[PDB]
Specification:
Chain A has 426 residues and is α/β, with parallel strands linked by helices. Chain A has 13 helices and 10 strands. With 48 residues, chain B is mostly loops. Chain B is rod-shaped. Classes of the chains: A alpha/beta (426), B little secondary structure (48). Chain B: This is Ubiquitin.
Chain lengths: 426, 48
């Protein structure tokens, strides 16, 4: 990734704590965290060599090689500081799936990274489009099959590397509509209630262990994975404003696979025990005493989740000027896996959407009708055209100076048989 | 025939104090950081 090497040259000290509290910044950055330190991922597993003569497996864990009591502090740094969108209709299309059936949805985000200039040595995460996986959805939540969707996201990630796209985040909806005629939604996630449900932290943290971030200052080549978690819940007063958080890299790269499970309370999680499979240390945290202040009040059956999340800021690009947007053709096409709704189609939708608009008319409106995200995944999944023609279809959609690439596209025999098989079919 | 007593000193220990509290980071996760030069936040509505 070219974003990691560009911030190594610039120095920006940027790790000053008194400067970031002036501008209302919670945590500094990832790159200014590097220059203050030697990038070691903290491990909580049991050891198998132990540097002594005792047996590793049954018992015999010495104090020099024991995971100590976790003080359970928040992360002092962030991977990315501000996630940026590109169009207000991609979010409006995702909430439109909830408006038709009433139940929740789920999706993955595609995009890239660049430089953030508000924060010293910060990274901003630009999304480009939203993919929807196959899912089964209830009114309280959703949990799809694990295996059959992971088989599906290998080839569409193989289908996304030629444009310069990559899976950078995920979204899941939680609306809880009040009365639908005197207000938008309720206020389910606020300061008094839970901020993120503990059943979704284990799905957020597992996506970072499989999507490693390449770092040259580490010992294993990967440290502090860059994967954002976005949610559409709603703000306090009357809107459906979104929130974006990330999990801590000091614990969730290691502790989620063994000793983290979902409890019955939404603000806490259930601690697990290994019963001599591995060693689970003790968790220390704080609360407020009724008359004074406590010190170390709870050992086993409680730990909050809000010690473990960092905050991020979402944003939308301005309407008057922008650098690039790269994907605006309609943003109203039927998506991939909206099978519960009515937008799951066939060759009939190509007659209704474009039909290679005004067949022998022009090309300027055709360029603004073929650079859609879910359109190019559909016509390549039909695999009628040759693979070298599909490479030319990429530079004719998302790449600038598209005029000399579009005329050589339609003059080939690959584009001619698509409009011949479309006119005969319904 | 020679005698020396000793010199003293050596071992000292230190104490450490804690950070803020439970409920400051409960309120630190619910606020805004600002608009970098010029962006928008949200304007949407749903369910007819």
């Amino acid at each position: 990734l070219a974003v990691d090497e560009e911030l190594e040259k610039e120095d920006g000290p940027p790790w000053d704590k008194e400067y970031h509290e002036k501008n209302k910044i919670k945590h500094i950055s990832f790159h200014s965290y590097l220059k203050k330190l030697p990038l070691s991922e903290p491990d909580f597993r049991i050891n198998k060599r132990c540097h002594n003569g005792h047996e590793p497996w049954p018992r015999g864990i010495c104090s020099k090689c024991q995971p100590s009591a976790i003080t359970l502090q928040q992360q002092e740094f962030r991977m990315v500081d501000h996630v940026e969108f590109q169009k207000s209709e991609i979010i409006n299309e995702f909430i439109q799936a909830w408006r038709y059936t009433g139940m929740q949805r789920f999706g993955y985000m595609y995009g890239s990274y660049s430089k953030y200039d508000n924060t010293p040595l910060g990274i901003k995460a630009v999304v480009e489009a939203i993919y929807e996986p196959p899912q089964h959805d209830e009114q309280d939540g959703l949990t799809m099959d694990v295996e059959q969707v992971k088989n599906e996201m290998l080839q569409i990630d193989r289908q996304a590397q030629e444009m310069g796209l990559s899976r950078i985040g995920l979204i899941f909806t939680d609306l809880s509509d009040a009365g639908a005629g005197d207000g938008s939604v309720f206020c389910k996630r606020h300061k008094d209630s839970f901020f993120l449900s503990s059943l979704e932290v284990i799905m957020a943290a597992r996506h970072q262990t499989r999507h490693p971030n390449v770092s040259k200052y580490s010992e294993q080549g990967f440290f502090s994975s860059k994967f954002v978690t976005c949610v559409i819940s709603g703000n306090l007063e009357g809107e459906i404003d979104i929130s974006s958080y990330q999990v801590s890299t000091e614990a969730e790269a290691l502790v989620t696979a063994d000793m983290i499970s979902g409890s019955t309370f939404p603000s806490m999680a259930y601690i697990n025990d290994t019963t001599d499979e591995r060693y689970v240390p003790e968790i220390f945290y704080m609360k407020s005493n009724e008359y004074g202040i406590t010190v170390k009040e709870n050992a086993k059956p409680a730990f909050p989740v809000d010690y473990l999340l960092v905050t991020l800021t979402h944003g939308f690009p301005n309407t008057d000027t922008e650098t690039n947007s790269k994907f605006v053709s309609s943003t109203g096409f039927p998506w991939s896996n909206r099978q519960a709704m009515g937008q799951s189609q066939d060759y009939q939708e190509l007659k209704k959407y474009l039909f290679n608009v005004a067949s022998s008319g022009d090309f300027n409106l055709l360029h603004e009708k073929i650079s859609n995200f879910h359109l190019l995944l559909y016509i390549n999944s039909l695999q009628i055209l040759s693979p070298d023609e599909w490479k030319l279809l990429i530079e004719s959609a998302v790449k600038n100076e598209w005029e000399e690439s579009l005329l050589k596209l339609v003059s080939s025999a690959g584009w001619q048989t698509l409009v011949m098989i479309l006119q005969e079919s319904g | 025939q020679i005698f020396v007593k000793t010199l003293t000193g050596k071992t000292i220990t230190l104490e450490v104090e804690s950070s803020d509290t439970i409920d400051n980071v409960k309120s630190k996760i619910q606020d805004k950081e600002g608009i970098p030069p010029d962006q928008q936040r949200l304007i949407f509505a749903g369910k007819q």
